[model samples]
Target: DYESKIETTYQGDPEEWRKAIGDYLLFQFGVYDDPRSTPPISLDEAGIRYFERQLNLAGFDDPDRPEVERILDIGCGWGYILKYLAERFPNCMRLDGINVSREQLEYCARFHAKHGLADRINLYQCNAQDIHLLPDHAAPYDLVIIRGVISHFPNELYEKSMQALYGRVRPGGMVVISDNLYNVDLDEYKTPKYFSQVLTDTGFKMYDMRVLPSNIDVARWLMDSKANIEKHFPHGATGTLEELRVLAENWSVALIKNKVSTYSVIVTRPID
Candidate 1:
């Protein structure tokens, strides 16, 4: 009934979805501990370093203008990016996070508080496609980040979602999107070109976009997720298994074929 009004094609209560299969993803290949692990800091540190370089190119390296301070994380899972941002830019006037999962928001709130980010980081359980469901934003954000969240959408809703995010950025501000894009997995939903086009079509100039190559950390996550996923459901859903198999095959093809790669898309503007 109500589905008709909203894009229910890729819609649901994310909290329920999380309850079904959310905690399982906590084993963030690099951060999850085991003999192969590089301990605590190793995993997130790599991502932080990469994130730093990308922002620098977009002018976070510019002299402290103070006006360039409102930061937003579109799918601010577990508050990692916001926490990291707070650590790196403590003076930011507001650090806001919104996501569809109340479960995630609950954990993220505790996370922010525990890390002393309580004042700086404000967590809201809200939908990315419909941020109006939450209170009005304090102001347009200077840097908006939506990571690892785009591909899950069906194509029709995808572009509309991109526009919602793109419209949120202030002039000279940036939107950073990082997600996997395949070269030629026929079953996979979208290609890198499709994702790139969606952004460009939404009026976002690709300030910089980096293709993700396979590495030990990437390999580690893949293997661990495979094992953990197996343990969770020893006997269910060949389709889920197929998803894993396809991803495994896609990575090798990337080395020679360069068909598939994860991309860190830095969305920004040219000063008008």
Candidate 2:
């Protein structure tokens, strides 16, 4: 199956990586845990804005379509983006976020209760690549989140993952994706553009794409998150925040020096 084909060489087992990091997953980067003031420049808004804009453009905002909408986050770690969308979505949006790691979901429950978002969020422990395993043909999603997951995937699994999500999200499906393409030193064919081609083939048209600033990219965000992570899951030998942050910081430095880049790509899956 496609789920079994996923090979994350440097990252190790997905669930274990998630388990060790716990809710302190700023280790994954973007330092995105501030639910208090979800800022204008925060990760939540960065992801949620495009979904709103796309829904607006597609007439989903019209009062005539008063029924509740559905949103999915395939690699939703702590259901962070869902928190933002659940609060802001006009006409009532129901959010489902699936993470393959059950460890994350256990923490997600506490997170949902902590933020009082248990009613709005639905968290499932399903592999994104084999979403069809879910009942009713993987549930209908009007907007889907890729976050930083896709850019890290190996080529073959990436295709399967994208195609799988594409089938579930409807014609009006909007994807808000933030990925650092510079992390992998792959050949030209395996670059971000190549994986984006996979998205286009799956019936998506990118309406808005923002390239990150050279000085302020995902790398910068990762390194900046170092201290916060270090304080809690402090470094001693192995299960330390320092060790985890280094994976991101080292990659960030390499990304800048090597001149690769990250981006905020907003795309819509259309009917036609």
Candidate 3:
């Protein structure tokens, strides 16, 4: 409900989205100037690398870490991470995702089926707040991921959603979150401290946190978006070209001013 309008913005032709976003259809920004040594990569590659970095920070790369069985992705955009997980984590059998957009889920079904992940990935059309009511709302999931969408969850929604998720994660399980963190006051976004406090209050230990170099590449993101806007929207389809330009300009300004930056955080339920 809180994100209904924003969810609809994502509803459109998947092919068009691929042209605008990438083949993965991620709604999030990717890290461009990472490693500082390698040549610049494509947006899709950068996005995948960022996700890989998050998974590693969560200790999934460690040999001693427990094998994850069940996983859930909150606001799973186009089921990209689910497909990534299905390919990477063989031990993970059940990959569930909750999203509010029907069109996005329909595309996900087709995408997963094509990739042979139709049986492994399960998607539900519901808001984050109503996840508890899911008939398959089985508790004690091994891992949970909330990425790029925490900005949509204000304080109350953020806290409530994490509180509901607390019991759903198995003891010793992990939750990874990646989103914008504000250094200055903003009504729409939150600071990193606030995000950590809420998760800590929900009984999850803050395991790791990282602010990515993606902040430096935010301008590239804006440029890419604007370029795609010009290519896709001659007279503007969903949003006027000028409207999207203003939005992108505002975004770049936000980053340049240090008002907000991208961050990845991992928290874990203690072993009882």
Candidate 4:
């Protein structure tokens, strides 16, 4: 079970945050309601691209095969990765998405329906720590994928969440975990604090890790865009990348050594 104290502090108004982030993504990246409008390349897409490239560099490309029957996406935001993977692997019979935000889940449902995949994709609005409650219809995901999620968790809850995630994988299944590692001294901007230790203690044997370069200039651009959004709309903006980077580095130095600020890990549960 997840730690209540840690969960309470980390959960932090998922509806409001998701709505703000979704709208921000749509507006900032020019994502459109129209399906035919050549879907705007998104920050999510950019991040995923970077991750995929890293996997290739590490010789982990084709990690999923045609025989992989099901996939689980932890914190699947707006169904972006779900949609991408489903389109790429039509033979994959099930794509299950678990997220804490009801708003995001509803949005995903609508998106799935719009894409003619309503029956193929399952969306659940539940905490990651409670993934076992997933209904029978969404059970036995063969490959579980989580990106930019573990970093958001507090230290105490981190191991529990990792265990829950590991439990979701069947024998011979794989888990793709990606996030910003704590490279305490890196000049790259806007990393968050409190992630490195959480990653280290999560108890998964790391398959691989890497620090890919980020667009530092884009961090300032995002800060300005966030300010403009708040000025024009009645929404809130969090700290700038620079502010986040300082916090991230400070915490990283205190906890981890020789880690890249951004990286991904691929792990597998031992077959019983």
Candidate 5:
């Protein structure tokens, strides 16, 4: 089933994996080389910068107006992005996050509570494809953030997920997506043009789009992660180590050759 089609690493104890990896638990490529920042950036720092850029594209950089009350994060990992949003958007009353992994979902809850954001963030354990079954899934949200989650969905499920996100957003609300894009013909990979057309068919006005080449940073992350994993789990970590290495290496080459890239997009439902 598609629900169980996720990578095996996520099905285990996330805390253990976090111990092996770093606390950020971010798996996607990050935005490095910001002139304002230092020459060498840590993975966490680069990831935060990437989030900043995503928020800027979504017009959330200006915290003064446009009152964002409700939000949703599809595939929220370790509650880092949720924490980021909660701290920045004070007008938000409800913020919900969905994930297919039970351990990760539990970790998200505890992590938010530990950071004193429990009241502001809610966690739901469900595959993104089944988000429509949840009661709160139908509630309107002012903003929806999806990062690196759609890769697990096939084309049909991906289109339906966008339509569902469209229905969940309030009029004039926005959805921001940041994920890997591939020009190859594969179930998990989609080109930038394909993504835009799907959003158009789902009735969203494309607000902003950026294609980022993250080969350098992704390779850097792979090297750092391998070293850290070895140090933390001397015996061995999860079965994902080899898989991660393979994927990251392939991604690096593809990104370098322009066959695969990262896309940051913002789309909004029209106020009409």
Candidate 6:
């Protein structure tokens, strides 16, 4: 079972609450298993290595450089990415993670400190929509990363949030968004029933996309739990890889098109 709660304050004890939530997600999401079998990697070691690769590809190679000093991670669960980045680029940049759950932030902070990354990592408890409201002088992030966050919003909010995120990006900066896109009709999925046409409507061009390959067991589990999965994953299951590829082709033809499902997109803001 999953527990969801909304909190009003962004500042709290930073220990008691966030840690518990982190533990819960770790348990529920099966992050502590002997081998991690998720996207970007198949084995636990590969997962960690993949995360390292993500940092380099995401432009964290030289954290200390002023050009890439600030990195913003939306919905950073337990600050996993932050912790990893901080360790690798400790002298190069400062990392900030924004999450809705105060409990999750607390855990992230503790974990970060435990790994001696406390000085480089910062955790904030706030909804995604409020990210732009952070003090202007705090730091203008050069790279904004969103993983598995888009599916959480309905189409309208998703578009609005995208626009807001775009506004936050400095000229020449980039936004990396990783989401599941499928070709099947919206009604087919019991959850994430809402479709996202933003790529076409908003003019955000796709630089790259890939269809993620999955084993039969994973595919079967997803199809079987269609109904109940929506409770925990309100956005619904991703469409089949084939469908995602088709959508990518459509996006490529109409706009800054390059399509692949099961991968990610690296889009830059118009220099204008």
Q: Assess candidate 5 and give its TM-score to the true structure.
A: 0.88
Residues 105-146 of candidate 6: C-alpha lDDT, one tens digit per residue: 777888888888777777777567667665555456677777
For each candidate, give its TM-score against the true structure.
Answer: 0.71, 0.71, 0.90, 0.63, 0.88, 0.60
Candidate 1 overall lDDT versus native: 0.62
* Candidate 3 per-residue lDDT over residues 15-47, each given as its tens digit: 877776668876667776557426656657777
lDDT of 2 by residue, 1-272 (tens): 34333222222433344434333342233432335435434433323443454445445567674344787777776565666667767444467888765555776777777888887788887877777775565457777767677755677777788777777777766776766665356555245667578788877887666553343445545554454455544544243334656676766666766656656567777767
Model 2 poorest ten-residue lDDT run: 5-14
Name the 10 consecutive residues with the lowest summed lDDT in model 1.
24-33
Error of 1 at 207 (Å): 0.4
Indicate which candidate wins on lDDT: 3
Q: Considering summed lDDT, which 10 consecutive residues are worst modelled in model 5?
A: 1-10
The CA lDDT of each predicted structure is: 0.62, 0.59, 0.79, 0.56, 0.76, 0.50
- Tell me the tens digit of each residue's lDDT in model 4 across 118-174: 888889877777777887744566677776676566655566777676656665566
Model 3 misplaced stretches (Cα beyond 4 Å): 1-3, 33-40, 135-139, 186-189, 234-237, 240-245
Off by over 4 Å in 6: 1-43, 49-66, 189-205, 213-261
Error of 3 at 5 (Å): 1.3
Instruction: Candidate 1: list runs displaced more than 4 Å.
Output: 1-41, 64-66, 133-138, 185-189, 213-217, 224-259
